[PDB]
Amino acid sequence: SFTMDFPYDLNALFPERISVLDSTTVIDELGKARHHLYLLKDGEGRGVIVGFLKVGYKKLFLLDQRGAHLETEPLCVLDFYVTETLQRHGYGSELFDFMLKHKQVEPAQMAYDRPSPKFLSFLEKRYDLRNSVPQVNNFVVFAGFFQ
Ligand SMILES: CC(=O)SCCNC(=O)CCNC(=O)[C@H](O)C(C)(C)COP(=O)(O)OP(=O)(O)OC[C@H]1O[C@@H](n2cnc3c(N)ncnc32)[C@H](O)[C@@H]1OP(=O)(O)O
């Protein structure tokens, strides 16, 4: 058994629509705002869930470095969040490094679904992913993806 608290924001942006019922009333609604989801908690001292990371495979139609079309099905980062007040504490790096270690895969080999400015900075500074191959499908892949 274990305890689980969701900050307001992480609770709403949860990448899974979940209704929790009590034998019949509802305890919590998450998500109002081939796959693997990673969650992370901290003793603080009364516990709390601080981040989540969802990755999964997805068939993608991409352009290569010279515009040639091509299909591929890489592991993709689909959702990635750390409750706001606790960003830049290292939690993001924790979740991400675990995922890589166990999925046994490198950042440059992944596609990134609609990364935000914070996530881009995170990828660029922490994993030196800087050179992106332009897409038109809202996924971001870097040069290593094709090498
Ligand atoms: C595919 C999808 O999931 S789309 C992307 C999702 N992004 C969002 O929803 C917005 C923000 N939410 C977040 O949870 C975080 O900002 C994440 C997921 C990007 C990173 O998690 P954090 O725990 O905050 O990152 P962590 O503390 O592990 O590493 C720090 C690095 O992240 C980046 N970072 C985190 N917050 C910021 C910020 N406000 N401005 C700029 N860079 C930031 C920087 O590269 C920073 O490096 P520095 O501290 O050396 O400058």
Side-chain angles (χ1 to χ4, degrees), residues 1-4 6-33 35-40 42-45 47-58 60-100 102-103 105-125 127-146:
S1 169
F2 58 97
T3 184
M4 269 180 161
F6 295 84
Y8 184 111
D9 63 340
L10 188 140
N11 189 257
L13 297 172
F14 203 78
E16 300 290 353
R17 185 74 180 83
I18 300 164
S19 299
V20 176
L21 319 192
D22 191 45
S23 214
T24 64
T25 68
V26 52
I27 293 160
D28 185 16
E29 303 284 0
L30 304 89
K32 277 164 132 64
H35 278 10
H36 208 130
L37 176 60
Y38 302 84
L39 308 175
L40 188 74
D42 222 20
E44 120 188 48
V48 44
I49 311 286
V50 305
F52 62 68
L53 167 63
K54 185 193 211 170
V55 300
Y57 300 91
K58 166 151 210 296
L60 295 176
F61 285 93
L62 296 176
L63 304 175
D64 72 347
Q65 266 123 334
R66 292 191 202 283
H69 290 76
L70 81 98
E71 174 169 67
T72 184
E73 182 165 22
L75 193 76
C76 301
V77 178
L78 274 24
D79 304 88
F80 192 24
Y81 193 75
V82 174
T83 187
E84 198 217 292
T85 67
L86 302 196
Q87 284 173 17
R88 288 231 219 207
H89 286 41
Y91 290 138
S93 303
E94 259 195 276
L95 268 165
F96 204 72
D97 289 335
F98 186 109
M99 183 270 302
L100 297 174
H102 287 58
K103 298 291 300 176
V105 63
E106 281 167 343
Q109 279 164 352
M110 297 182 78
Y112 301 83
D113 182 352
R114 238 133 34 192
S116 57
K118 285 178 191 171
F119 190 22
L120 289 177
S121 155
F122 169 100
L123 290 167
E124 292 161 353
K125 292 180 180 177
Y127 305 88
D128 190 35
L129 296 175
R130 293 171 296 182
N131 299 126
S132 117
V133 189
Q135 302 306 323
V136 298
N137 71 339
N138 287 296
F139 274 78
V140 163
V141 292
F142 293 90
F145 185 92
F146 301 96

